[PDB]
Design a protein around this ligand. Structure first.
Ligand SMILES: [Cu+2]
Ligand SMILES: [Cu+2]
Ligand SMILES: [Cu+2]
Ligand SMILES: [Cu+2]
Ligand SMILES: [Cu+2]
Ligand SMILES: [Cu+2]
Ligand SMILES: [Cu+2]
Ligand SMILES: [Cu+2]
Ligand SMILES: [Cu+2]
Ligand SMILES: [Cu+2]
Ligand SMILES: [Cu+2]
Ligand SMILES: [Cu+2]
Ligand SMILES: [O-]
Ligand SMILES: [O-]
Ligand SMILES: [O-]
Lengths: 278, 278, 278
């Protein structure tokens, strides 16, 4: 493999995180005060890493951090129930652990933590984070397995109710690649709606990594994936592979949601920077 | 594998079953008159087993027994259309067969019956069982393949419209386990709604058994599964594996649905019997 | 395998196609003028084939042809944005290529084009084809991989909003087979609703072909499949295998949708042409 690959994990990483109310009314996570995003920052790690996150709630209401997929103790589940949220102005340290797969004492196979996951608030608005999530308190988490192929860039598309990334309808987000790039997309759904994520000109494997191991990988290949609230998948694609440059559309294929604004562009450029038709 | 495993099938099993109207308005299946449950009793069998069920309808309206997954002749499909429902007070013997996998004469591969299946009414309220299903006429069916790992206990979570197991909003069901137990979940959806089943602190394989065969199983690992009417999956988890004891929440992650009551507790206890925080 | 298998692709195929406004008000694709259908004709090809489709728009409104899964350049994505639709009375040649799977230069594994795909309009009603798709501008596309088992017949079932193949509620379509026939279903969903496709007495593998490769194929076996707008899968079944002849119901298991009309019959006949109960 001429491509970069993920190393074996086992680091103890540290991370400061904030929750901020944004001037537009939204709420967002950030790694630096004043630099909060919706979606929030991407956290990326290797199976075996441990992550300590000193999370500071800079808001006037309680807020929390809840993650999918990773190992955490109940003290870190981010729920009011388990006394795990954070009061206004407070600071709590959360810990996420990840393990490699392997055989258990009983001969059964323990799955690893690798995958395309995500984190979100669990206590704003309701004890399930309905307000925090609607407001933008969600972000992606990637856990890589030793050997995983690494992309040239990672992009996060979140269908949150009937928006992408909390944007006004019909305003993207667009993003750009050059024909040939190894583009990784993290796709997360939130809210009370169901969607189908469709991408013109490109397809991927409906498995953990979006990539087939080889000739024996039985995973289906698809260009259209159904998604429900708190579902998260990812894939990698070769921008324009076999199809060339262009303004490639991505959208929710729900005809109503398409019409109502859930559309963006994957702008795959030629080596000279141009996009056929423009 | 030092865990118990399912034996080869081939038995001819007999079963008596009833449909009763319950004092609280609902309708339920049972194995003994006066002991009907919503969800109904679990039927569990091995590939190759045959099941003769003498089903007696103790209600004042036609009722039936329709099963997913297993082999049955049209006389046992449980529809009014094919004359295989049951008159009030009547008694009828349904037969379900199961088979092992193996090679067909044409060299193709016939799948076996193994899986996480279910049974429900088909003629109450409408010719599609809408009333019976609404009222509680559904139950789980497990078909095991020789060698399948057996659990310490099995639990059935049914998302029926916007309830769990037909319970009142925000009333569980909760279950208890001890850190270390092998806990099997049978998850069934019924009605006119779509859901995502989420479970804190735990994850499983999105394949037939919920378990990875080993290092080569390409099955994706998830903690959030989308489900539609009459969908049915299952899985096993090691209670608290890598995360400890606690009041672990499970719910539909549809923000509206969890707000409206669709939440339960998976109480994983320390060996002293306690649950962190209480 | 003593059943017919798909050959290696590589042909350059040519195809003429029309969009016709039908007298009942719908819009359909056809291969011959005056012989348009909803669903439109089945296009079927082998990995490596190229297909040039001279598509003539016979209607009073712009219309287009957009395909899932296969390779196409941006000049052929069928969108207004990319100047790829067809004006009334106009004629445009779209091109679809397909490729075999194989190893990329970087050691990674490029998936082939094989699958159960589909094509539909992208510019009638809205820039997402909401009108065309509503009216019936959709059809199936199969891309076979060398060695794929071929069926005795293929049938296409489209859940379009709350109809099957744009039919009036409770009017089928029905299909006939003989016990033993190898029957292929192409299942496609369009519109703004979500569905579960259920079939009595039969089951299939939730992978690309609906078939297990053999004893090592980890794919789940199911009889009930969730589906969203622009989703497309297919499978093969042996009509009546292990269950006998009969009037086998297929429907959307959404209790509301089946009550509301989304039901059809798979009439599996005895060798004497009869159907148990009639
Ligand atoms: Cu939660
Ligand atoms: Cu959508
Ligand atoms: Cu498309
Ligand atoms: Cu969540
Ligand atoms: Cu049915
Ligand atoms: Cu729900
Ligand atoms: Cu969670
Ligand atoms: Cu059913
Ligand atoms: Cu599109
Ligand atoms: Cu439906
Ligand atoms: Cu059924
Ligand atoms: Cu489409
Ligand atoms: O599309
Ligand atoms: O959650
Ligand atoms: O059914």
């Amino acid at each position: 493999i001429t491509a970069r690959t993920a190393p074996a994990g086992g680091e103890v990483r540290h991370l400061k995180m904030y929750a901020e109310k944004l001037a537009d009314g939204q709420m967002g996570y950030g790694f630096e005060k004043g630099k909060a995003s919706v979606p929030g920052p991407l956290i990326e790690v290797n199976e075996g890493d441990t992550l300590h996150i000193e999370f500071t709630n800079t808001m006037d209401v309680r807020a929390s951090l809840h993650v999918h997929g990773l190992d955490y103790e109940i003290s870190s589940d981010g729920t009011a129930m388990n006394k795990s949220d954070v009061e206004p102005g407070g600071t709590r340290t959360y810990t996420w652990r990840t393990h490699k797969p392997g055989r258990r004492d009983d001969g059964t196979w323990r799955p690893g933590s690798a995958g395309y996951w995500h984190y979100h608030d669990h206590v704003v608005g309701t004890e399930h984070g309905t307000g925090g999530i609607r407001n933008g308190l969600y972000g992606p988490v990637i856990v890589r397995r030793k050997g995983d192929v690494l992309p040239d860039a990672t992009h996060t598309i979140v269908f949150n109710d009937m928006t992408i990334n909390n944007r006004k309808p019909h305003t993207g987000p667009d993003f750009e690649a050059t024909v040939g790039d190894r583009v990784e997309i993290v796709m997360i759904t939130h809210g009370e709606f169901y969607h189908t994520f469709h991408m013109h000109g490109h397809r991927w494997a409906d498995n953990r990594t979006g990539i087939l191991t080889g000739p024996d990988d039985p995973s289906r290949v698809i260009d259209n994936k159904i998604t429900g609230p708190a579902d998260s998948f990812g894939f990698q694609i070769i921008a324009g592979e076999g199809v060339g440059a262009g303004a490639w559309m991505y959208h929710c294929h729900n005809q109503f949601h398409s019409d109502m604004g859930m559309v963006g562009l994957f702008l795959v450029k030629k080596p000279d920077g141009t996009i056929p038709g423009y």
